[PDB]
Enzyme design. Structure first.
Site, short mmCIF file in Angstrom:
data_model
loop_
_atom_site.label_atom_id
_atom_site.label_comp_id
_atom_site.label_asym_id
_atom_site.label_seq_id
_atom_site.Cartn_x
_atom_site.Cartn_y
_atom_site.Cartn_z
N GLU A 125 0.77 -1.23 0.00
CA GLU A 125 0.00 0.00 0.00
C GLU A 125 0.80 1.27 0.00
OE1 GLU A 125 -3.06 0.14 -0.74
OE2 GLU A 125 -3.78 -1.85 -0.13
N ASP B 108 -6.21 6.40 -5.31
CA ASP B 108 -5.68 5.05 -5.40
C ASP B 108 -5.67 4.60 -6.87
OD1 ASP B 108 -8.28 4.21 -6.00
OD2 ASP B 108 -8.53 3.06 -4.22
#
Length: 164
Positions: A11, A20
């Protein structure tokens, strides 16, 4: 290696609101704020999560707190999920970390939809599961991450994460 380090690898860590892979507003260590296109809505959700007027920026400690909460929630979601729990209980420690990763990325619902793979994992048919897992949008959209996770399930080792 553990779930925290593993996801910290997958991440990254960003202290300012970002988009994202799907273009959704996120912050910290993959903490999804909202699927809404509005940056305001995202700033709103952030302040509400943090408990203060952030102005879209957080500290490292605040990020890590969101992270702990998020990991916890993922685990808890799995345990409460009738489709996931039995899989999770059947796995060894390494592979469990791989299931948590998927849940963290895609949500409990998302993962619970991989019925066939789930069944293969439950039966310990590693290679077979690995092939089935790869026939997915998940793998085609985030192939490098997917590969690391799939290898983890295939091998039951952290080899895919060693070197990063």
């Amino acid at each position: 290696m553990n779930i925290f380090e593993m996801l910290r690898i997958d991440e990254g860590l960003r202290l300012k609101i970002y988009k994202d892979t799907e273009g959704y507003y996120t912050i910290g260590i993959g903490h999804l704020l909202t699927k809404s296109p509005s940056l305001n809505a995202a700033k709103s959700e952030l302040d509400k999560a943090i408990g203060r007027n952030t102005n879209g920026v957080i500290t490292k400690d605040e990020a890590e707190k969101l992270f702990n909460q998020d990991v916890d929630a993922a685990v808890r979601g799995i345990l409460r999920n009738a489709k996931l729990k039995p899989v999770y209980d059947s796995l060894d420690a390494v592979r469990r970390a791989a299931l948590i990763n998927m849940v963290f990325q895609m949500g409990e619902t998302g993962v619970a939809g991989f019925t066939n793979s789930l069944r293969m994992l439950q039966q310990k048919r590693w290679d077979e599961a690995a092939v089935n897992l790869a026939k997915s949008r998940w793998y085609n959209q985030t192939p490098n991450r997917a590969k690391r996770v799939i290898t983890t399930f295939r091998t039951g080792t952290w080899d895919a994460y060693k070197n990063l």
